[PDB]
Design a protein around this nucleic acid. Sequence first.
DNA 1: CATTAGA
DNA 2: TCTAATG
Length: 327
Amino acid sequence: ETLNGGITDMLTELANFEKNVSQAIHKYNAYRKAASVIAKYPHKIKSGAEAKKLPGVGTKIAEKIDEFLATGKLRKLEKIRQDDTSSSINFLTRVSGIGPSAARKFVDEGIKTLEDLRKNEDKLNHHQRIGLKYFGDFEKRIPREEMLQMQDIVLNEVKKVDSEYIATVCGSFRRGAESSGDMDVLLTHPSFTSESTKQPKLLHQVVEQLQKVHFITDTLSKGETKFMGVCQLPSKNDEKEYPHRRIDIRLIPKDQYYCGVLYFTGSDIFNKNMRAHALEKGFTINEYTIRPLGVTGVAGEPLPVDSEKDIFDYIQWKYREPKDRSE
DNA sequence: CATTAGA
DNA sequence: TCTAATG
Ligand SMILES: [Mn+2]
Ligand code: NA
Ligand code: NA
């Protein structure tokens, strides 16, 4: 956690530059398991050798260790830190819709800067075009103060359209979070569940709504179950327009809301942990369900959940507020 | 790890 | 279809 930090931290720098800058999945996949192991290690690593005894720790990694050990630095790391080619790749990547694959091609062609990106707005696609569009606006965190405003509005149409609609803005904002990146709207409806061969207009209805009112300014991707877009709070009596924010919304088959809902709320740790528990408790919890465990090794038989409580009750746990899903 | 664009 | 990108 702290004792074997730089080491893991160095290793990730490394892996990262492999998977991104280079198409070296293995080496990349190498640095990580390593950076993972030394991470596990109950003692202050001292020599490459000592590290070396570890699964995943071969000579190559081990080597960097020492040099890093003696001189808190690394040439390979220092070099990667310099190299504009690589420097560049890491940056372009920031644009929503710009992956490595592209970060590199862009680079080759000579798409080094953002302005490059602009001049060649043509070499880009709508995603990455909106990505470039709200580059500033996107890198910014979503003040809860505004979270609540948004939250509200969204809720309002969801109802207006059809009252049978169920909306949950999940995520951090849900967990009391003073800030957030993008807003996470969970959706569902009655007519929609496990079997009932969809009703796509379901998702469709609302998006259409929020566009109507002008909440949702654009579309990143609109699927028959997943919407990914851009939104904005009505710029008040001028002088202070709002930042364009990232919004996501997904219809859920009511006979698997809460689980998802549970889940999408997290936190990352709470879930695992909680998830880890349902296990001792004869269960299994996944993004959608809560199944009873059978001794044959494994089992199915999807349990019926009417709220956060049920899932809990089931694995027989304490009701934990969103606020406390912290871990 | 499943969902969308795109080519 | 495959292959990228987001989450
Ligand atoms: Mn989020
Ligand atoms: Na070893
Ligand atoms: Na990106």
